[PDB]
Design an enzyme around this catalytic site. Sequence first.
Site, mmCIF file in Angstrom:
data_model
loop_
_atom_site.group_PDB
_atom_site.id
_atom_site.type_symbol
_atom_site.label_atom_id
_atom_site.label_comp_id
_atom_site.label_asym_id
_atom_site.label_seq_id
_atom_site.Cartn_x
_atom_site.Cartn_y
_atom_site.Cartn_z
ATOM 1 N N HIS A 238 32.758 41.307 83.848
ATOM 2 C CA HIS A 238 32.362 42.232 82.786
ATOM 3 C C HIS A 238 32.854 41.850 81.379
ATOM 4 O O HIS A 238 32.741 42.648 80.444
ATOM 5 C CB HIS A 238 32.892 43.639 83.077
ATOM 6 C CG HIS A 238 32.377 44.256 84.336
ATOM 7 N ND1 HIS A 238 31.341 45.159 84.342
ATOM 8 C CD2 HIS A 238 32.794 44.142 85.623
ATOM 9 C CE1 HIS A 238 31.145 45.582 85.579
ATOM 10 N NE2 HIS A 238 32.008 44.972 86.376
ATOM 11 N N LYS B 193 31.879 54.971 71.135
ATOM 12 C CA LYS B 193 32.344 53.925 72.056
ATOM 13 C C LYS B 193 33.828 53.767 71.784
ATOM 14 O O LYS B 193 34.335 54.216 70.745
ATOM 15 C CB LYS B 193 31.641 52.565 71.861
ATOM 16 C CG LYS B 193 31.600 52.081 70.422
ATOM 17 C CD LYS B 193 30.650 50.902 70.169
ATOM 18 C CE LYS B 193 29.164 51.261 70.250
ATOM 19 N NZ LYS B 193 28.517 50.524 71.375
ATOM 20 N N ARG B 194 34.529 53.079 72.677
ATOM 21 C CA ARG B 194 35.950 52.825 72.451
ATOM 22 C C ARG B 194 36.171 52.045 71.146
ATOM 23 O O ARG B 194 35.333 51.215 70.743
ATOM 24 C CB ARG B 194 36.560 52.052 73.646
ATOM 25 C CG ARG B 194 36.676 52.888 74.913
ATOM 26 C CD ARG B 194 37.740 53.984 74.794
ATOM 27 N NE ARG B 194 39.074 53.410 74.589
ATOM 28 C CZ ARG B 194 40.002 53.239 75.530
ATOM 29 N NH1 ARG B 194 39.790 53.617 76.795
ATOM 30 N NH2 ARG B 194 41.183 52.717 75.190
ATOM 31 N N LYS C 265 33.767 45.584 68.560
ATOM 32 C CA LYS C 265 32.663 46.544 68.420
ATOM 33 C C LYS C 265 32.304 46.856 66.954
ATOM 34 O O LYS C 265 31.250 47.464 66.682
ATOM 35 C CB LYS C 265 32.977 47.825 69.194
ATOM 36 C CG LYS C 265 33.033 47.601 70.727
ATOM 37 C CD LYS C 265 33.516 48.827 71.501
ATOM 38 C CE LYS C 265 33.647 48.648 73.021
ATOM 39 N NZ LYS C 265 32.327 48.622 73.754
ATOM 40 N N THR D 263 26.342 49.932 77.696
ATOM 41 C CA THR D 263 25.530 50.920 78.395
ATOM 42 C C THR D 263 25.237 52.143 77.528
ATOM 43 O O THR D 263 24.208 52.808 77.728
ATOM 44 C CB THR D 263 26.190 51.379 79.709
ATOM 45 O OG1 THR D 263 27.513 51.796 79.419
ATOM 46 C CG2 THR D 263 26.221 50.244 80.709
ATOM 47 N N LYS E 34 21.672 54.645 76.949
ATOM 48 C CA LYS E 34 21.667 56.114 76.903
ATOM 49 C C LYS E 34 20.936 56.602 75.655
ATOM 50 O O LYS E 34 20.172 57.568 75.712
ATOM 51 C CB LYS E 34 23.086 56.685 76.897
ATOM 52 C CG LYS E 34 23.953 56.271 78.102
ATOM 53 C CD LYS E 34 25.410 56.669 77.947
ATOM 54 C CE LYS E 34 26.266 55.900 78.931
ATOM 55 N NZ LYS E 34 27.677 56.149 78.701
#
Lengths: 810, 810
Positions: A351, A542-543, A548, A650, A654
């Site tokens: 992952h 998101k985290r 990111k 993911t 969504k």
Amino acid sequence: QISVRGLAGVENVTELKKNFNRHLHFTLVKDRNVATPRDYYFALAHTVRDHLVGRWIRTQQHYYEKDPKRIYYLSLEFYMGRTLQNTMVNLALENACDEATYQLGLDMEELEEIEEDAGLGNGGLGRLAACFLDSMATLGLAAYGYGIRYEFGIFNQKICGGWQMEEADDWLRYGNPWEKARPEFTLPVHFYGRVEHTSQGAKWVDTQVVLAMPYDTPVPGYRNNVVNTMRLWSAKAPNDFNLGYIQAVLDRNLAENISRVLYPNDNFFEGKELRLKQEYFVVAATLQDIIRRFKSSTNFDAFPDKVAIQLNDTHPSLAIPELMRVLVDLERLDWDKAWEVTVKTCAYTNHTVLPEALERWPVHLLETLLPRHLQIIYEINQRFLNRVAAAFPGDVDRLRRMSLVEEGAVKRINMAHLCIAGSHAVNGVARIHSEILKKTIFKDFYELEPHKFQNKTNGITPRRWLVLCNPGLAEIIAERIGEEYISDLDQLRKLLSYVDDEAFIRDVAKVKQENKLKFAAYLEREYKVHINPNSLFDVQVKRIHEYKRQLLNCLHVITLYNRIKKEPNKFVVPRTVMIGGKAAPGYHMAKMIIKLITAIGDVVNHDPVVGDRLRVIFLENYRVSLAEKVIPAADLSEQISTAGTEASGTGNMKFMLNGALTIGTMDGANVEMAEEAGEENFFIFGMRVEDVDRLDQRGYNAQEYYDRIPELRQIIEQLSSGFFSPKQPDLFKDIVNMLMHHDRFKVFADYEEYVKCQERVSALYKNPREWTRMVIRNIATSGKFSSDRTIAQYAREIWGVEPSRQRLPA
Amino acid sequence: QISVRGLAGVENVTELKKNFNRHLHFTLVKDRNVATPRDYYFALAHTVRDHLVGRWIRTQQHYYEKDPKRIYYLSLEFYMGRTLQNTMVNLALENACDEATYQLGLDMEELEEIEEDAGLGNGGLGRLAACFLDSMATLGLAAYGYGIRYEFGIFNQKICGGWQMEEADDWLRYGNPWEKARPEFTLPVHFYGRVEHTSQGAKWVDTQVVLAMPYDTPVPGYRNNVVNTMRLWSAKAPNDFNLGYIQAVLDRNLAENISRVLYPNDNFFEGKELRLKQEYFVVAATLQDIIRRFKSSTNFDAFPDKVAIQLNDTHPSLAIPELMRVLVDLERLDWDKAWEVTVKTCAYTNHTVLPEALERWPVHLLETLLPRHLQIIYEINQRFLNRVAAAFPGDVDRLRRMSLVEEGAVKRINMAHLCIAGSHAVNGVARIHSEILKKTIFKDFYELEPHKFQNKTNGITPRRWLVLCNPGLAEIIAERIGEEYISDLDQLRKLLSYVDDEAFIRDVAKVKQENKLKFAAYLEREYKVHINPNSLFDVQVKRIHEYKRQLLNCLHVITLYNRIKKEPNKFVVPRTVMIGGKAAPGYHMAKMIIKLITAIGDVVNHDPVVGDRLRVIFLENYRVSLAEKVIPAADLSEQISTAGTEASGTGNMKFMLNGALTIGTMDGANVEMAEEAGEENFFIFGMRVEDVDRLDQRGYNAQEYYDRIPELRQIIEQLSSGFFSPKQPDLFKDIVNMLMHHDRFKVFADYEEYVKCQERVSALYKNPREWTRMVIRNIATSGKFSSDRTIAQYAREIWGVEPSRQRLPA
Ligand SMILES: OC[C@H]1O[C@@H](c2nnc(-c3ccc(-c4ccccc4)cc3)[nH]2)[C@H](O)[C@@H](O)[C@@H]1O
Ligand SMILES: OC[C@H]1O[C@@H](c2nnc(-c3ccc(-c4ccccc4)cc3)[nH]2)[C@H](O)[C@@H](O)[C@@H]1O
Ligand SMILES: *Cc1c(COP(=O)(O)O)cnc(C)c1O
Ligand SMILES: *Cc1c(COP(=O)(O)O)cnc(C)c1O
């Protein structure tokens, strides 16, 4: 009320009301004069749970009789969220329960809000495990999820003075009505000790014992009467443990600490002994349970025909040497046969490619804690490298690169290398990621054993992520194309026929507007914040992590602020920019980013010249229940990781399912989403993977971008000078220093393209008809991203079992 | 089957069967193919619990409406034992449940054996609290028991190589179906901090907080539909506790350790901080709950009209300064008014005169842990001593003796003195004990305030200690005099009319014989030991302590052995001598006594010349469930404490009710038992209190007895020489040394009279008709020792409330 929520028949409603009152009286020991809303929630939860039981018993009986191949999904994280609404959805009870509770003078939505999230994961990896369980049950697979029952899940985030504070997530305080303790299937797990070599093989002796007690939670499939099991292990001391007297009893806590708390990291590895104990604890208890179930149907030749073990990253990688230990040391199989069985049984999903996320355990830890497993690992390594040397003779550097044992100051075991060696299949989680694995970090392994390497693009369950969280959208789709799409999401392609239909366009936009109003009201009541629900809802949840690039979003927000201040009387499309997510407690830069976001809000939200044209909101305590509220309300989904860093994502999926457009880089599954929808229906920008590589080869110099882009220079000068921190002028100097000199993720290199692309978003939002037409093209092509598709591929291509949509008897 | 167990009506049996199957399926999630005996136990327990619920709710509603005076019984120990059978007895469900389970193919007695004892006490004090709860419910009093929910109760005793080993009593492992968690009534408890004096009084600040979460257990009355509550507090950390991150979560254990484990001492005080935290924890949570309930009906003048607080020894003595703290610091009452309310509300029961059992807390502990309470204690002391000085001017030594503060190397607070000062009533627990209090240790207090001092002789509940454990005896009594005696035990006097009735004599002896056979079979199956059930069953079961003189019994056993060896072909009445009880883990001499008993058994039980004429058995793990089995089987009850040391005893009363004769000293309640039965129907021997005093005045010299009694000298020489420890000849030298030089309890001084009295026991046992006639005279006069009598006296003479035998509606 709405059709996708099922029937509310008089007999069903009457029976639900009767059982609700029974549980209030007998189970909760309350009458209606003293009952609180929490008591009413529990009475409803027990009422709904009773409908699972018959199906759960019958499902497990069915597997015993038919003896299909069993799939064991091993994970250190299961991010389940709430269970009440999901159970009602999957059993077609939602309208009946709504009617029953309405007749008793109660609002079911208010009762749903009382339930705690089961927060037993950090983010995407743990949530993927939860979606997978839902899909496996819906596809009729004989599947078991195995993990740890953490007493404390992911921490609750509070924001104090703009800073993250952590508090313990005491999720079990009021009880968990969904689980069933099974103290009768308690098993021993061994730690420490030493190895003796007799003439009768190796023996692991003088160990400390911890007991693993299982708790079982039902996992209902979608309207098929299948109920599978999630089995989570809890740590218990034996009764003779340490047995002055008082201290010995108090010291039982040392053993029971194994299942106390989830390590709250996302994409980051810490080599702590307690984490290694957690990993072995899950593996050892699980494998004994698997073997016990296999014997109750010693010919281990059939073991891989009846058992598949899927490793969710390297976290349960000790399953490989543990399976070898059991087969060789306890069952007395010869090494070669045991290895054949192990490899055919185990499969590994990777992952992440970030080097700091990869598990590399110091040899001295393994030596002390798991001395027999270390011996087995060395033997695996020697036999594996013998094969490498035979295939690539003289390639001495390849031997060093491929070794399970990394040399250095501290010798370590590379757990990913162990998983590849010991698994018949290795997969990444989106096409670009799977390709990156074959070309970069696992290139050597791919050259040796190309047949092992696969892709399985991630997905999300459309039960939780459409029907449950966005019933209005589910309904208007169902009005046109029926209900079959809920378990066959590819049927959403039929919506391309309605892209020019004025009624459908109106209904899609109406649902979004309702969701936005509902979310704006949620914000006002629970958090005292007012927003403009006509504004574009621009959402990044998101985290918090440098890869990111929440920081890139911050630079765009400041750019918009500065443009308004420069030309205050020009029209701009109003936005509400919402950013949320948790930072790992030890991750200083992530905590600084949260502070920067709230500091920008402090300036922007109180500037009278800005008005309601721009609002910046930090969404506190982002978790699965909050995702269910904000995702249906979003207009724009921010998916802006540096190309090559987000293995899949993911959240992206969504948002696509729920009628947001996406602004994003060509990273992870974004690539495939754009391919499905058409690039013309996506806001793609920035460096591709190849461009990042080219910049790395000549060397990234952030100063060049600072020197050439005046708008960027203005922002850096504002950050440095204390514009956003007037009381503490140097507060953000670590952020500035990182961006200018040590930025691994190249924030400045994508700034110009990102800002220009954001201008195109704004231009389209001004034309609501065309915005909504583009949205329809996204929703209509989101079918590939069902976890039912993902699981069907694992089943056929890795596990060797056929999915079934057939119903068990009711 | 038998009448006292109630009716098995077709409709009741049908309904019980239906609900049993419902709980098996829905509650336990099993079918009959996979269910174990433990699952069947739980299904029955949930079935029976459902019958309590309506009554529990209705009882608490009734108290809310009528608002009677409420009685709060505060104890650090509640030794409850098992609950299933007791609940069935009190609801008249026993025969119906027996029939229902029989029809389902199950044996209810086998299911009863699965239940764990709730072992939340050490012995007599904790068991008294349990009997009291039963009696308060049976007498319709609005009574609440308050204590601590220990995770680990009194340790399980294993005997290894003849030595006691302790193991943790993990009584909650499988769940407790009887309790209901009430996390909604969770309250804060404060520790440490410091005191600030403002102009607005004193403030206790900078404290550490622990949460007290209550668990409620129903307490059913005997066939009156009253169900009272036992509320036990469990310790929980707050969620911001210590809030690197991982360690902070793990350190929550430090707060939660307060309710982890019962201190396993009986009649011994250790000044440990954790024990003081337990004591305050119970008091602080309880008093807030009491005050909250009082306000929900600030005029505290009526508080003593609506509230009584009974202190079970000094263990909850901090209730006195805590009540003062709340009234003065929080409610702003003036000191004098607060003190008036406190004294009228509180009453204290003393349970021991042994100096090493009295709680005397170091001032430095109280200063650090409870600084405000220490200030309040000093103020109480100064005002109390001002009264003493006014009543006895110039009596400077009286001031020192009566002070709450003891001077010395370490200053201490005498908690008993605090309880006397702050209570309107002080009682002992048997007439001789209450007299000893007034004449010796509390003489000064009695002179100042004679009106405070009372007696309340202890009792036992005839529900548990006759109907439940000895149904055969209950039935043959009921055949003659009906069932009313079960709640009016004085009616047993009617049995004096049957002392010459040949049928009744036969039936009494038949029941004893059946009980002995049943117990002999229990021993063989669970412990691989064979006994002669025609022998006299000579039983001493109680905690191991020097004052209880298990050692005197050992000397008699060796005497009988030596007499047999001397004249092997002479007839002697066969005996099975059974001794059981736990030793506190730190009490070395008590552990040595256990070893001596097993060592005597090792010699006696394997000597072929002895045959089955003498057997010595150590009964392992003596606890409430074992007492229920052995007491009905006993012929002779050993109650042989040194006169003046056993405050009451309650085991003595259990044996009397169940058809054993008593050999005993004139100590505790033995005095009153002999008075009720007639001295001619008791085997009384040994020094009276006055004789012990006379021997103390001239000085106890054990050597004199050794020199004058040849049979005693032979035993001491056997112990010293290694006769009972051939592999370790000096094993028992500490026992010999204590008996010869340092014996506080004068074992040798009662040896001659004890042996002679034992010969009279043997003589009577040879005449079974006359033995049984004497037994009838004991059972017939045991009525005084009902805890219903005891509780009626507390109610009328201390609490100011009237008992009721009236039924609430069903
Ligand atoms: O496939 C599902 C998701 O897995 C995430 C992930 N990849 N690695 C982790 C990860 C790594 C380590 C830990 C960790 C936690 C505690 C202690 C040690 C390690 C948790 C999650 N999470 C990726 O970043 C996403 O792009 C992907 O969509
Ligand atoms: O009235 C009921 C019984 O109380 C017993 C008792 N008297 N004191 C205690 C006692 C004292 C201290 C502790 C204790 C436990 C843990 C920690 C500290 C003290 C426990 C019990 N127990 C007496 O010995 C009995 O004669 C009497 O029948
Ligand atoms: C889906 C989800 C994630 C993963 O989001 P990404 O944007 O893919 O990182 C994280 N947290 C929660 C609560 C989620 O529901
Ligand atoms: C009644 C009882 C006691 C008290 O017995 P004494 O002989 O009065 O000390 C102790 N333990 C248990 C288990 C009891 O039932």
